[PDB]
Each structure stands twice: as structure tokens, then as C-alpha cells.
Amino acid sequence: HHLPETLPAMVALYRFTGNSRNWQRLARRNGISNPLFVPGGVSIEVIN
């Protein structure tokens, strides 16, 4: 899923699956250093 803007990992996860507790998995699998700034334009792999 693409992102219209750079969001924190928790918000980005909640918008796409509805359970924000596994917010570290998204950041680790994507490869972001700071989870607060998830890049917007690039593709993002989200596990439901």
C-alpha cells in the first residue's frame, strides 16, 4: 500500500489492518530506521 504522506508506524498500521500493537514488525520488515517517519511515496508491505 502506498502512503499519501509520511505517517508514524502505529497510525500507518492501524489505518490498514486495525490492530496497532504489532507496529514494530512493519518498521522492521520495511527497513525504516525511525518508525515515526515511514516514507510516503514508496511502497509499504503490510501484514494483515
Binding site: 505517517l7 508514524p8 502505529m10 497510525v11 525511525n34 515515526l36 517517519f37
Partner: protein, 174 residues
């Protein structure tokens, strides 16, 4: 600021909340997030501190661990202290004249090791472009003079790292 944007995005989304860049929520979000901004700046500068060539907080520790404070480290210039640490940490080499020229030039000086004049072991260190002035940078103190005049830094360095068998003979040129 990006940190206040992150805080506003973390805050709930709805009609009751106003996240426009002129509201009290934004004005308080900036103050709330600036502390973590400074913390992130410190954690980022640790990456620069990782090396002794650019470290500022850990210069004392990088000098104590390396046993640095000696002749080749200049009087008070933080740039020269950093350079001495960064050279001593990765100084390993041979005994050849080419390597000695390279090592001497890596500190900013300029020498050439020419053949002897009286014997065979007594090689001549011809030192060119002598300059004893070191300009005060932006890192060093506010009380330091504009120019620091230091002499004899290369002499004892080469006498310390010279081959055991050989004896050098220094000649200054211009």
C-alpha cells in the same frame, strides 16, 4: 517542524480536534516535541562521535585509551588533537623511506628522505615548507589566540617512530 507534525498525527483524528498550524494544539505540540527533538539530535551526534577523527565529547576517553597525549599532539588545537588520535589509531606500517615520507605528510608537513652525506645509516630528512602557524578553528575555545605558534612537532615524532638501527639527520629548507 517534523516532530510536531508527528505528534499531531499521533493525536486522535476527528472533528473536535483542530490541527491547523495556528491552533493551541499545535502551539503546545511544538513545546512537547522539542525535548525529544534535542534527544534525537544527541543520539545522532553519537554517530559522529563513533570515530576519533570527529569526536568531541569522547576526545578525553579516546586519548586515555590510546595513550595519545604526547609530542605529536599540539598545544591546544582541538583539530590537531583529533588528527593525532585519528592517525595513532590506524598507524601501522613499514620502515621504508616512502612510507616515512607518507606518514610525515599525513600530518600536514612535507619532508623527503634523501641519501646520507657522511655514512650509510644516517639518512637526511629534508624538511620543506616549514610553517609554525596553526589557525584557530571554530571548534576550539573562545579564549585561544587567532594563531598558535608551535615548533618541533615533526622532530620528536620522527625520532620516536624512527627505525631502531638507523639515525636521522634533519635539514631545514625553504
Amino acid at each position: 517542524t517534523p516532530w510536531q507534525t508527528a505528534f499531531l498525527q499521533l493525536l486522535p483524528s476527528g472533528l473536535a480536534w483542530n490541527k491547523s498550524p495556528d491552533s493551541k494544539l499545535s502551539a503546545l505540540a511544538q513545546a512537547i516535541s522539542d525535548v525529544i527533538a534535542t534527544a534525537a539530535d544527541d543520539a545522532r551526534q553519537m554517530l559522529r562521535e563513533r570515530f576519533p577523527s570527529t569526536s568531541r565529547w569522547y576526545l578525553g576517553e579516546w586519548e586515555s585509551f590510546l595513550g595519545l597525549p604526547d609530542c605529536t599532539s599540539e598545544n591546544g588545537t582541538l583539530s590537531e588533537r583529533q588528527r593525532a588520535a585519528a592517525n595513532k589509531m590506524r598507524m601501522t606500517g613499514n620502515l621504508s623511506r616512502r612510507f616515512y615520507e607518507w606518514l610525515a605528510a599525513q600530518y600536514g608537513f612535507t619532508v623527503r628522505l634523501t641519501d646520507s652525506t657522511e655514512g650509510q645509516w644516517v639518512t637526511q630528512v629534508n624538511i620543506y615548507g616549514i610553517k609554525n602557524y596553526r589557525n584557530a578553528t571554530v571548534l576550539d575555545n573562545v579564549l585561544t589566540p587567532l594563531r598558535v605558534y608551535e615548533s618541533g612537532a615533526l622532530e620528536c615524532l620522527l625520532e620516536k617512530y624512527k627505525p631502531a638501527h638507523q639515525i636521522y639527520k634533519f635539514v631545514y629548507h625553504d
